[PDB]
Structure formats: C-alpha cells, structure tokens
C-alpha cells in the first residue's frame, strides 16, 4: 500500500470571539499514512495553555492513533486572512517525534490582542481559519 506522506488541513472556527474557553477546542480527526492508519487532530487553547501564555492563542498538532510505535513529522501552522493568504506562519525547525497521544505545537502561536484587532483582518465575520501542513518523514 502507498501512503499519504504530506497533507494540508484547513480548519475554520466560527464565532471565535464568543469562544468562552486552559480549555481546549479540538478539531475533527483527519487521516494520513497507509490505509488512513495515521490519525491526527488540531487542538487550540484560545486563551492560552498556562499562565505564561495567557495573552496568546496556543495551537497543537496531536497524533490520535498510529499502528506502530513512533511517527516523525514536520509541521507548519498558519492563519488564512480574508484573501486566503497565509499569514503569521510558525513551523517546526525539524521533524518532531510523535507517539500515539502526544502533541507538538506553539504555546505562543499568536497574540490574542493582535488576533482580535479587526485592522489585521484575521477574524473576518468572527471566523478563524487555521492551516496546518504536515510532512511525515518516518512511519
């Protein structure tokens, strides 16, 4: 069997301003690898993860299940503006080692005040569109 070895997941969160959430928003599960056997999701802390990131939105890629032991993968997160352009990109500098149940991401992905300022056009109609591009280098 062949494998989906790179993939891009687009996720829109409606009414983001009214996200009454350390509380997590979880995306749908999406699949990768051979026979859809690698399962992933995105997880968002809209008000931060811990106290040191209260001013930020945190965003993580989580490996939900995998057939073997480890998966090594590079990943990139970005926000799509109204024009569909990628902006505020952050990417792993290297492949990270994932095992079933483990996440990797950015506690300080983006400042809340920057995200909430309408002049930056990142919440058109109160909608946050995240973009996650993954490249699996092993498994």
């Amino acid at each position: 069997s062949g494998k989906v070895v790179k993939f891009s997941y687009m996720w829109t969160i409606n009414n983001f301003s009214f996200c009454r959430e350390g509380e997590v928003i979880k995306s749908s599960t999406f699949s990768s690898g051979a026979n859809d056997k690698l399962k992933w999701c995105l997880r968002v802390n809209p008000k931060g993860l811990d106290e040191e990131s209260k001013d930020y939105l945190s965003l993580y890629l989580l490996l939900v299940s995998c057939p073997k032991s480890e998966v090594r993968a590079k990943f990139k997160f970005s926000i799509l503006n109204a024009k569909g352009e990628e902006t505020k990109a952050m990417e792993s500098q290297r492949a990270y080692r994932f095992v079933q149940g483990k996440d990797w991401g950015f506690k300080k992905f983006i400042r809340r005040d920057f995200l909430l300022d309408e002049a930056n056009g990142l919440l058109p109609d109160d909608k946050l569109t995240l973009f996650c591009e993954v490249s699996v280098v092993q498994d």
Binding site: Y60, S92, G101, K102, W104, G105
Partner: peptide, 7 residues
C-alpha cells in the same frame, strides 16, 4: 522551538 503538553 515547539512545545508539548503531554509527558
């Protein structure tokens, strides 16, 4: 650098 929330 990326961070993880799980031990």
């Amino acid at each position: 650098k990326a961070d993880t929330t799980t031990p």
